[PDB]
């Protein structure tokens, strides 16, 4: 009677940057629902394709827990059919996404008075990301006609930038920890039930 | 197509009550959620109450917990916000918003459908 | 919603400071652009304080709190242009300031000559009414025009030129208020208020 | 080098369509944040649209549903399709490469788009009577004409010194209006006759209007 | 190949602030971070903070968090480090070095992974006392400083502030046998050093020995004759 | 602080040595560890950078290793120029910044026993005329650079008015130090003699001076 390790994802001490989002593969365990919506007025909670009150009555093949951090103005991009610097170049959700999105203000954890520049995001990419694609590439982005050859110069810029989470910023700029739960159901034996 | 019709505001004394109503139109099914945002003088839009329709699950911020009640009447597809024991803090323009999801958000930009605000003054 | 002062006036060789205000100006970066007359803008300052290659060290930026600042040291006549700030913050849209004209003083300060005309009796019979406010002989070439009904602000129906260099190197401008004959006869007086670097000149006409 | 050459501007009737081009040199459009920015005649800068390197497009509220941004990788050119135009859209349109954090470095020379009515109409001339309250200023209101310019003389050119004909406005209706004033001594208002001679060559309008004090 | 030249040494009063520069030859910023590390006399190294120009990013060490500023002007290609509200314990040599960057892709972070090229360091001294010229006294030779026909004579440079003081003998004509000792920091906050030279005892009656003390902070030169 | 190094280390020339570096999860738990070599008086230089990568100019005699929360540096074929300070450092995240070790001083055995040369100067008549008195004891040409100084008034020790410098490496790789004793012109004339005792490696050399 192994319980699904949901505490390791929400109560994790450090989240990953958005461009290298972490995914915890959860299966063969006793799930739960209550905490999900019942909990308390904590954060954002949006489900797509499934109802939270019905999660306890459904069995799934695998449940994927994606966790990362972005700023406030970008939480709306973690949703099916969204565009933007986060949705197109960091973490894209499919149009037929079946799952829920959870995001809370973690200004008290991930923002320092001198700026917490450890959290990074991708700024330049030649094409859009497919759903559930993780690009950790750090190659010099060629924005011009001449090749870069690993030379940071004109029309050759580094593809990552830092978030600067300072607690004195506006709420649209404060760090937000995001937890995305994907519910998959394919031709397989279902193991992630919650009763 | 989709449209939100708001009503119910007015002037009230501290301690009084008020009932806001939001009528949701061009929705195919019951898979949407309603949120109430109030805009105090000089403040940003802030969520106060949410309802996931398909689940019939309510959520209220702590400052309004026992004073506000949200509910839905099925036939007229209208969500009601019963505001009791009103305080001067509650003075704001209130908006209802809808989104194609089951849940709730603090971010206004996350709701694609908005009604026109109704004025609530408590003094 | 970026707010910039309408104009700055700095003696040649001195230093200018241009402010760019807004709410929650901490996290977002600021960019600055120079637009000489008849030219495309040229990025002069990016990411608060960086100068791109080839741009003089006289320019410099800073940003904190609710105000960013563009600083131009040792000003010459080649700096006479309009300067706009722009925020980087939003990834789906960009907004610009209202622009600031930095007139390099080539002559002493001149206060404007304001002349206001009521609608002609011939225009009123065509069922039209236009208040004509003409401004001339002011230096530097930067003015703002506010209209008044009795003593209440009027915003609709106002058409104002941009300051243009006249013969004696001073500047001229004109402001028009389109009204209906009923609106002109209802109130007791209309006013044209012209402000030029702190000083304010006002003229008033009445339906008689 | 680096060049952003634009084309496609001109005059177009309201509600019409016009497509703008932005030929690029040295910079690859398909791998850059490319934007369009228009500047109304004598106003500030207003960002219009953008195109991501990945294909996502975003527009301003004032052009949503009416404008469309596209590109062609073979020709390395940025495009801006404009439908259902109005006079509010009349501006000089620029195309530039966005570097986001590093701002918009390279800009195009800009093409001009003029949207209004058309024609060759004549102005309505109204006298600006001198006020009854040591010098006095009287003039002529040359109202609603297109296109520029008009010539204003006083007393068939016999009055020159003191005359000040101001530059014309471009009303939101697309029509022009100007005023020409002459500041004369107060003592001559009753003994002298003042007549402005307004000529509009394109409509061949020749208006002579007397300016008498208001009764 | 590039080099990191920092600003000259600094002496400040408690409460003031110091700003140390660090020139980066050309485009050193490209794929290279910069760290600021200080080292108190006889103590270990202490990371203060850093910056990454390609990421437009910078971090600070807990200890100095709230009293330090690190800038990087990319046009000039150089970095700065300003420490305010200085205390006596801040007396140290402040170093500036380029850090080769490591990419931890597992957690999506970018931190410094060693600093190969170093600056020459900047000495910063913080003391409450103010400037004062030294009192130079001769250390005469006798039979007690003589050993094997060679004599040791010197000069005492006592009670000066701040560093440095340069000492020469006979306007530079005498160099061999000279040993100028590092100055001691007295409890009063003033410095004192000594400079001695060993010469043949036979040259005491034939050669005159003068030590040339130079304390540029006080604009004082002292030429002290040392006789038996 | 979390990182720890042994204070000192000894090794026979031509043989192998291991310097240990002990850490936690907050530094070595998820971040690389590097090593720096600093000669006394000079500036530190990079020795190892990604647990065990060597920069250009560092020979293969130096080898790094990292296991869990501990790290180690190995030096094979010890040479004289390897006598220096060795620091390990890792990017700790709890404090958001690099943390340096306490350092490890390395001593190569092959050096001899250079005894210190001591010269003691009495207060000059010019300083006594200024109502001051300073005894200067200069110590040079001693290796290894570690000495202890003691002053004696007549036949009794004294610590009041003593200021002593730390040892400093000279040009000939030997070390130097200086000690000063401040006195009043009366304390100088009152006692019969003053002595400067310099103890180096268990043995002491004493010089004595007396008023004129
Ligand atoms: C972590 O679990 C605790 C219960 O031990 C709970 O109170 C808390 O809300 C959890 N953290 C988050 C971020 O949900």
Author numbering:
A (entry chain E): 333 to 527
B (entry chain M): 1 to 123
C (entry chain L): 3 to 210
D (entry chain H): 1 to 133, 138 to 219
E (entry chain A): 1 to 228
F (entry chain B): 2 to 213
Q: What's in the article?
A:
S is the major surface glycoprotein on the SARS-CoV-2 virion and is involved in viral attachment to target cells via the interaction of cell-surface-expressed angiotensin-converting enzyme 2 (ACE2) with the receptor binding site, at the tip of the receptor binding domain (RBD), in the S1 fragment of S (Lan et al., 2020). Following attachment, cleavage of S releases S1, allowing a major conformational change in S2, exposing a hydrophobic loop that executes fusion of viral and host cell membranes, releasing the viral genome to initiate viral replication (Walls et al., 2017).
They show how these antibodies can be adapted to broadly neutralize all major SARS-CoV-2 variants. A problem for many IGHV3-53/66 antibodies is that most VoC harbor mutation N501Y, which introduces a steric clash with the LC CDR1 (L1) abrogating binding. Omi-3 achieves resilience by repositioning the L1 loop in a mechanism similar to (2), whilst Omi-18 shortened the L1 loop, which becomes flexible enough to accommodate mutations at residues 501 and 505. The second, right shoulder, cluster was seen in the full set of early pandemic antibodies, above the S309 site. As expected, these antibodies (structures obtained for Omi-31 and -38) attack the RBD from the front and sit above the binding site of Vir-S309. Changes, especially in the H3 loops, explain their differing specificities. IGHV1-69 mAbs Omi-24, 30, 31, and 34, which show reduced neutralization of Delta are placed close to residue 452, which is mutated from Leu to Arg in Delta.
